[PDB]
Each structure stands twice: as structure tokens, then as C-alpha cells.
Amino acid sequence: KDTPFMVQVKLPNYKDYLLDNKQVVLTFKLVHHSKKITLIGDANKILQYKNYFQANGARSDIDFYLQPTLNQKGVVMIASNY
């Protein structure tokens, strides 16, 4: 069956991210295949990302873990199928 994976990607400010079409498509393929998503960064930034994926169809059986940080630039997303 599917190869167990963990993918960590470095994402920009939510605003700039929406302007990077290739990055947006990549993150949605990641979410599509994941059962666990962790977002690390400023609390408001990671909420933007969480809500955006959920607003666009992310299943309720995907577990989102928010790790707020202080004075950290950007967002880190970790996606896993286990």
C-alpha cells in the first residue's frame, strides 16, 4: 500500500503564498494525501492556512496541529499519511 511519508515544506506569508500558484497547488496535493497536518509559525498566520485548506474542502478527518511561535518568519507545514 501507500508509502508512509512525512513532508516538511517552508511556506511564506499567507498573503504572498496565494500569489505563488505553483506553491498553492503543491500544498493542496500534500493535504489531499495526508491525515495529519502540522503548521508552525505565528498564530494568526497558521490559522489563515488552516482555515484556507478547510474552507476549500479539507476533510474533517484530517488532524490539524497548530504550533504557534513568536517572532518567527514564515510558516512551516508538515504533512503525513500516518
Q: Classify residue 29 as exposed, middle or buried by CB count within 10 Å of its CB (0-12, 13-18, 19+).
A: exposed
Q: Are strands 75-80 and 36-41 parallel, antiparallel or unpaired?
A: antiparallel
**Residue 65 engages its own copies in binding (rule: CB under 8 A):** no
CB closer to its own copies out of 22 and 57: 22
What distance lies between CA 6 and its chain's CA centroid?
Answer: 12
The stretch near its own copies (CB under 8 A) out of 18-26, 36-44, 46-54, 58-66 is 18-26
Among 13, 23, 54, 69, binds its own copies (CB under 8 A): 23
78: β partners: 8, 38
**Residue 5 engages its own copies in binding (rule: CB under 8 A):** yes
The stretch near its own copies (CB under 8 A) out of 4-12, 40-48, 52-60, 61-69 is 4-12
